[PDB]
Amino acid sequence: MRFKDKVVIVTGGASGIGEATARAFIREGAKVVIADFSDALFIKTDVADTRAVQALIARTVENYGRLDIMFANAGIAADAPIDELDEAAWQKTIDINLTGVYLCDKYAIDQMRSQGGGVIVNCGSIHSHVGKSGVTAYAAAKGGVKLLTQTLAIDYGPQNIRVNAVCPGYIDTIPDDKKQALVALHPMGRLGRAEEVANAVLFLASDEASFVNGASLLVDGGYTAQ
Amino acid sequence: MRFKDKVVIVTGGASGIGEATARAFIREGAKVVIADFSDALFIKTDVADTRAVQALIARTVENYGRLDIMFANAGIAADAPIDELDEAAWQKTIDINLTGVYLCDKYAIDQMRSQGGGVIVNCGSIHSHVGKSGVTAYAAAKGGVKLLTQTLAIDYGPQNIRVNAVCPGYIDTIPDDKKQALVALHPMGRLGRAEEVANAVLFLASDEASFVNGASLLVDGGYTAQ
Amino acid sequence: MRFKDKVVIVTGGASGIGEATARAFIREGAKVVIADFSDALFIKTDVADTRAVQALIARTVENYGRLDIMFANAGIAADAPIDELDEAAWQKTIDINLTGVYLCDKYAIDQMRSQGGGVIVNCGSIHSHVGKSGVTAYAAAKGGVKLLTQTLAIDYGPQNIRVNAVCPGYIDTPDDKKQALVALHPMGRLGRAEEVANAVLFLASDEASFVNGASLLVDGGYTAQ
Amino acid sequence: MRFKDKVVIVTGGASGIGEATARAFIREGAKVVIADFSDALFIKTDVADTRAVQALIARTVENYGRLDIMFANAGIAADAPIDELDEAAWQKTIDINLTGVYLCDKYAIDQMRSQGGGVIVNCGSIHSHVGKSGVTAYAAAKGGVKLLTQTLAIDYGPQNIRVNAVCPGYIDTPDDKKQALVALHPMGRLGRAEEVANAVLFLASDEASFVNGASLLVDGGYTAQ
Ligand SMILES: [Mg+2]
Ligand SMILES: [Mg+2]
DSSP, X not given: XXXXXXXXXXXXXXSHHHHHHHHXXXXXXXXXXXXXXXXXXXEEOOTTOHHHHHHHXXXXXHHHSOOOEEEEOOOOOOOOOGGGOOXXXXXXXXXXXXXXXXXXXXXXXXXXXXXXXEEEEEEOOXXXXXXXXXXXXXXXXXXXXXXXXXXHHHHHGGGTEEEEEEEEOOBOOOOHHHHHXXXXXXXXXXXXXXXXXHXXXXXXXXXXXXXXXXXXXEESTTGGXX | OTTTTXXXXXXXXXXXXXXXXXXXXXXXXXXXXEEESOXXXXXXXXTTOHHHHHHHHHHHHHHHSOOOEEEEOOOOOOOOOGGGOOHHHHHXXXXXXXXXXXXXXXXXXXXXXXXXXXXXXXXXXXXXXXXXXXXXXXHHHHHHHHHHHHHHHXXXXXXXXXXXXXXXXXXXXXXXXXXXXXXXXXXXXXXXXXXXXXXXXXXXXXXXXXXXOSOEEEESTTGGGO | XXXXXXXXXXXXXXXXXXXXXXXXXXXXXXXXXXXXXOOOEEXXXXXXXXXXXXXXXXXXXHHHSOOOEEEEOOOOOOOOOGGGOOHHHHHHXXXXXXXXXXXXXXXXXXXXXXXXXXXXXXXXXXXXXXXXXXXXXXXXXXXXHHHHHHHHHHHHGGGTEEEEEEEEOOBOOOHHHHHHHHHTSTTSSOBOHHHHHHHHHHHHSGGGTTOOSOEEEESTTGGGO | OTTTTOEEEEESTTSHHHHHHHHHHHHTTOEEEEEESOOOXXXXXXXXXHHHHHHHHHHHHHHHSOOOEEEEOOOOOOXXXXXXXXXXXXXXXXXXXXXXXXXXXXXXXXXXXXXXXXXXXXXXXXXXXXXXXXXXXXXXXXXXXXXXXXXXXXXXGGGTEEEEEEEEOOBOXXXXXXXXXXXXXXXXXXBOHHHHHHHHHHHXXXXXXXXXXXXEEESTTGXXX
């Protein structure tokens, strides 16, 4: 149990990668707060809303006395090629997938600086690195997450805070032919599992990654290698 | 004169890189529309405002009959380390430097698809690639611009549209010691000139770059090489 | 105890990162073969010599039955700006740091294909990604290791083999030169060999079961700026 | 006419990209020396042989007085998945595609330093950035060329030399194999040698006066996805 009594916030924690990661942190002894739009302690939070994010962190600290680890993972996938992507759809993805990471990072960092250290893992993507047809707002957001991660690592690295991104390929959580086409882009010959992303998050959040800072860890079966 | 009678929009065109680029396109025979918040045809445009962007492109087409080249360059630099960066400052940079590029790209692409082709150059940055202390919102925005550029190249590449990013280092356009510290990060031993960025933009916008698509062209004296 | 009875080769195993990595694998239950130019079973091996590399792998398989994990880590640092870098110095770095990785990877992959799977961790560097003054042959070698890692991941990913690279920053293993190196790492210190070992064990483990073709930077922020 | 009386060497100059590049430089007023294993002055040169490379550069300087631009482009494509890639095939690709670039760059830089400046364009590849099935030695070589380019830009950038890499996708120079390659390029066709030449001339020109240490992809979108 590598996370005994560590206080962890997982955003987007009610499903998929977030749920697998919260479950893994609980298994390893952490005190976990799950934040999501809807249903470990659950706290409803719109990560695009600064007051809700501040309240999330404040409540966590009031309940447990500290915040050790933030996994800023909330995100939507609701996208289109640009000619079909309307402004409200673009903005919703930027709000949640990029601004939400800024907000969660900002208020986690304030708390961690007051403690003399902490660890952040941001949810990036293969699409922090490469684009794809129809993946317009999501790629833009995830590219921003990568760069945000890097600047934070530079500013807060010297202050005993590490900030890294996990960058998943496609995860099994659609038409058969659409699914086989996705599979064909991953050299390992299958999609990932959510627990496989969780495992990487726990590595980055742990002292096993004590000199890993500002890095993107691709969990993508080889997708970005080609 | 490589751009005789080509219709070009330059956003952020009233100063710095935008002004140098507009001037270069005019010298090479283009019909240029300069768009900026304030004072070639000038059209006041808030690039964060979808109706103003639509009107910019509509007016350009009404005046000149077509749009051949868009340089989506508007941007602000008004930033801080995250602990000092308030939400309104973050949002203003995301709005202008990222959403403004989406808007300009979106409505340029609609016009170019109706013509059977065109060329976009987006203004990226060294900070599409690397972070820097205190460069929080700007890095996030520019990282997003890079990825947006890549997806557009993938979606619209097959439709005779090329989309690339120019990625400048620091350009001479501050305390002496701050300036020498910036200079020290550029292996060529000086900051760039705006006309040097313009030259790259014209290359990417030209048929000399006819198989260049989805690419970032670093104009940074070596900054990102180390 | 993530590596109980797993058979591991660590090249460059007699010092620094290789030494720490072998010790870490031993702690976690592995049967470890250490390979190096000179002094866990130790087998003296010149990684630039194909007959030696083949013999290393054959002897590991003869002793322990199989080869689960290869950490291809041997490497020299003896470099110069190009105007001062002699052809023999260039060649020696390429031979050990790049061709040595090809050879170790090639013959590990033959065994891994035969036995139905396995895992390779190549030792890259920050200099798989960024150059630096006076780091000419070593950067070329490490850039090569990164791309080699990627192609291998693509070819052998479908064959139950994963191939990844660990990419260390500067590791503490002339005060003013040291402080200059430290100033390039945002975390404010050089890395430890043990920290690189930790990353190797992650990449070699079933915790990294969908990590393939990746470079994991262990650099305190060096490449982030 | 951007290159009036500029002295240029193009290695691998007898065909494809090298040929197109030399022709483009000649159109624009340059004095061009073409170097290749066999057939603008032509000088037969094995780029993997240091004496030959030194002789190439010396003869260019003796004939024309100086060396303004080096396009280090020689390169072979003869590769295989690692399990099929013999040591001699690996070595030949490394020798020509990586060590050849080191040698051309080294002796160009000596001349350029002596004369007070100059410009180098190295031929990288999409495979300086991404791997591909069966592209083992060539990807390693090209990854090496990218990092070599970066270190050179750092060391020699302050000395009025710029060093950059052009990185072509597949260039049209077995229908089903061709269509598969084409499907990987979003623009819907393979590139032309002339399109790579255009990028070389840009990077070699004063239009690229602040471009240093960069890789310019000429790939129709290949690496973007
Ligand atoms: Mg790709
Ligand atoms: Mg850097």
